[PDB]
């Protein structure tokens, strides 16, 4: 596979997102790291899909809403940042105030 350090690390984010999605599916309000993991994995999968940075900057605001998360979580998350390999190489996506 020739995994580099970031590829190994970022597997963790996907895993944490899968965990969090299972928790959401059984009806739990998500906590801070769960919410961050879901939105982060969404961004990295979006890059893999070939979306643009600009698309993901706006989609990232609609992945989770306040009723999906515990009290105070929306206000704890000022932004989420992730880098992934787009068709045009690695780029940074910053999603400001992802959960209103």
């Amino acid at each position: 596979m020739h995994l580099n350090p970031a590829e190994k690390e970022k597997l963790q984010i996907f895993l944490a997102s899968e965990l969090a999605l299972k928790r959401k599916a059984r009806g739990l309000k998500l906590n801070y790291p769960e919410a961050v993991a879901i939105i982060t994995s969404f961004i990295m999968e979006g890059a893999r899909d070939g979306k643009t940075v600009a698309m993901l900057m706006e989609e990232g605001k609609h992945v989770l809403t306040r009723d999906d998360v515990m009290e105070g979580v929306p206000e704890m998350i000022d932004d989420i940042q992730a880098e992934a390999t787009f068709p045009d190489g690695t780029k940074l996506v910053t999603v400001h105030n992802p959960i209103s």
């Binding site: 944490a16 515990m70 979580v73 940042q81």
Partner: protein, 570 residues
């Protein structure tokens, strides 16, 4: 020109009279004073103030009042106060708390806090800064426990052990000169301050004392090695000669005596009573009465902190594993069951709130959680505010008195108890620069950056391949202070005066900073900051009911805590 307060606090952190919520608790701390000069605040970045000829002085060499490091705009939470200041570090020590910058052009610059060519900057605006936690009940069982401790803001580990040997899995003991030497050498690779306890057991002086001369920083008396009147007596005789502290886990079984017999053996000498409530060990059921005495420095371990609806149910199996007991031996189970009591655990919450138990500690990996000393201190304070109300001593609707009482339990008080407060345990000028930055939303839960001897040792930081350090995954990671030979200069091995005089560091090739243990024998409960209360504690032998000043101390367990499921992935 005037700045409204919301905008001021957003830019520079809070100032006098502003309050900040601690994590998701209902505890609020209020800024008591601020050392700045409004308009001359230090800050760093593109087009900011700390630039040559401006807030950075371009004239002075490093020796001329210039800092190695300035933490700008810190909200300090410490036994000494809750207040706003810049913190100046030089030669790995805190040298100034006040106002940093350039006397060329700024008013009110603390004279030894010049930002110069030699000065690094850490932005502490919007952060709470505390002393590193001092954990004095550490079992050295698994090296992976160090990062666990760093992640919750602990910077000193005092205790014993040789790894996952049964003696160490039960007791904070590194026994004898050879094991002590081996663990001093191991310590060279641990990115945290360390002091090692010898076995406080024997009926002759020499076998105990030779541990001190070998490099131990103290002793542990533990019932699993025989917490007999003789072992107690000899250990305290050694400690009084050597100027080191003794920790005790007393005879739960009451085999050779009851609590009063242990106190008679102690004979008014100074001692640190571990897990004083007694689930973690001690004369059943009444050990917690130790915490009323003037010669006792009392600490709790953390799994009883605070009293919750699940607390009792986890303890029996925990205890049986730690102390190498067998479920098919009825007296083993009876011994274990005798240590677990809702009555004393409930009272322990209140005794903390009253300043009668002076310290917190972990009991890492031997009935305690390496990364939850700080966490559970604040959960306890929060529960007590909910159940008891604001303390009578509070003003302005703030919880500053309670916050000072509780921060002292895991910073200054354990340092005083151990004879190391000249080096560590508080944010004061002249002490080692072990500092923890916290985002208020994560306060007491997950440390932002842990500074050890003036260099960052541990940080919550993101993708190392990214364009900036903030992208995911943000996790706790060891920083440059832990790498190469820098691990030697950023950490202290605390040792007895005799071992230092006898040249043990040179003999073993120790390269770490060497700290001297001293002034351990001339202290008492009166010296525990904000937690100095002596009183007669009565524990009913039939009902386990705890009384102080004729009043039963009890409270309810809670079903939920702050600093819990909002934060943790597991």
């Amino acid at each position: 020109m005037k700045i409204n307060r919301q905008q001021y606090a957003e830019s520079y952190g809070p100032t006098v009279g502003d309050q900040v919520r601690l994590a998701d608790t209902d505890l609020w701390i209020e800024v008591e004073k601020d050392y700045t000069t409004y308009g001359d605040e230090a800050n760093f970045g593109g087009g900011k103030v700390l630039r040559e000829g401006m807030g950075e002085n371009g004239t002075y060499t490093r020796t001329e009042n210039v800092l190695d490091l300035l933490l700008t705009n810190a909200l300090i939470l410490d036994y000494t106060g809750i207040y706003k200041a810049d913190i100046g570090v030089k030669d790995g020590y805190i040298v100034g708390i006040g106002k940093g910058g350039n006397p060329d052009i700024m008013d009110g610059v603390t004279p030894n806090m010049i930002v110069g060519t030699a000065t690094e900057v850490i932005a502490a605006e919007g952060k709470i800064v505390t002393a590193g936690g001092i954990d004095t009940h550490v079992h050295f069982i698994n090296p992976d426990q160090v990062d666990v401790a760093l992640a919750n803001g602990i910077t000193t580990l005092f205790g014993g052990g040789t790894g996952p040997a049964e003696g160490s899995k039960a007791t904070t003991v590194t026994p004898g000169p050879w094991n002590i030497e081996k663990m001093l050498k191991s310590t060279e690779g641990l990115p945290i301050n360390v002091g090692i306890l010898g076995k406080g057991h024997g009926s002759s002086i020499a076998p105990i004392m030779e541990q001190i001369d070998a490099g131990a920083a103290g002793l542990k008396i533990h019932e699993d090695w025989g917490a007999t009147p003789a072992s107690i007596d000899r250990s305290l005789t050694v400690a009084d000669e050597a100027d080191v502290q003794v920790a005790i886990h007393s005879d739960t079984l009451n085999e050779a005596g009851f609590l009063e017999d242990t106190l008679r053996a102690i004979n008014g000498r100074v001692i640190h009573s571990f897990h004083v409530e007694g689930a973690g060990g001690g004369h059943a059921p009444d050990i917690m009465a130790m915490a009323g005495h003037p010669n006792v420095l009392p600490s709790s371990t953390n799994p009883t902190r605070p009293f919750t609806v699940n607390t009792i149910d986890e303890h029996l199996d925990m205890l049986m594993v730690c102390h190498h007991l067998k479920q098919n031996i009825p007296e083993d189970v009876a011994f274990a069951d005798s240590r677990i009591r809702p009555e004393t655990i409930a009272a322990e919450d209140i005794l903390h709130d009253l300043g009668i138990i002076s310290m917190m500690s972990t009991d890492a990996l031997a009935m305690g959680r390496a990364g939850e000393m700080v966490l559970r201190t604040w959960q306890t304070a929060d529960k007590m505010k909910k159940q008891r109300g604001p303390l009578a001593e509070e003003k302005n609707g703030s919880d500053n008195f309670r916050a000072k009482r509780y921060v002292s339990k895991y910073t200054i008080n354990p340092a005083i108890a151990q004879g190391i407060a000249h080096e560590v345990g508080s944010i004061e000028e002249g002490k080692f620069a072990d500092l923890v930055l916290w985002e208020p939303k994560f306060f007491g839960v997950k440390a932002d950056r842990v500074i050890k001897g003036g260099i960052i040792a541990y940080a919550q930081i993101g993708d190392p391949s990214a364009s900036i350090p903030t992208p995911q995954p943000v996790m706790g990671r060891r920083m440059y202070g832990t790498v190469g030979d820098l691990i030697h200069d950023t950490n202290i091995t605390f040792m007895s005066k005799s071992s230092i005089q006898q040249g043990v560091p040179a003999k073993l090739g120790l390269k770490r900073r060497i700290g001297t243990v001293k002034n351990c024998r001339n202290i008492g409960k009166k010296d525990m900051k904000w937690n100095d209360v002596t009183t007669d504690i009565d524990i009913n032998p039939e009902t386990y009911e705890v009384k102080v000043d004729g009043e039963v101390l009890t409270c309810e367990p809670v079903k939920e805590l702050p600093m819990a499921q909002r934060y943790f992935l597991f």
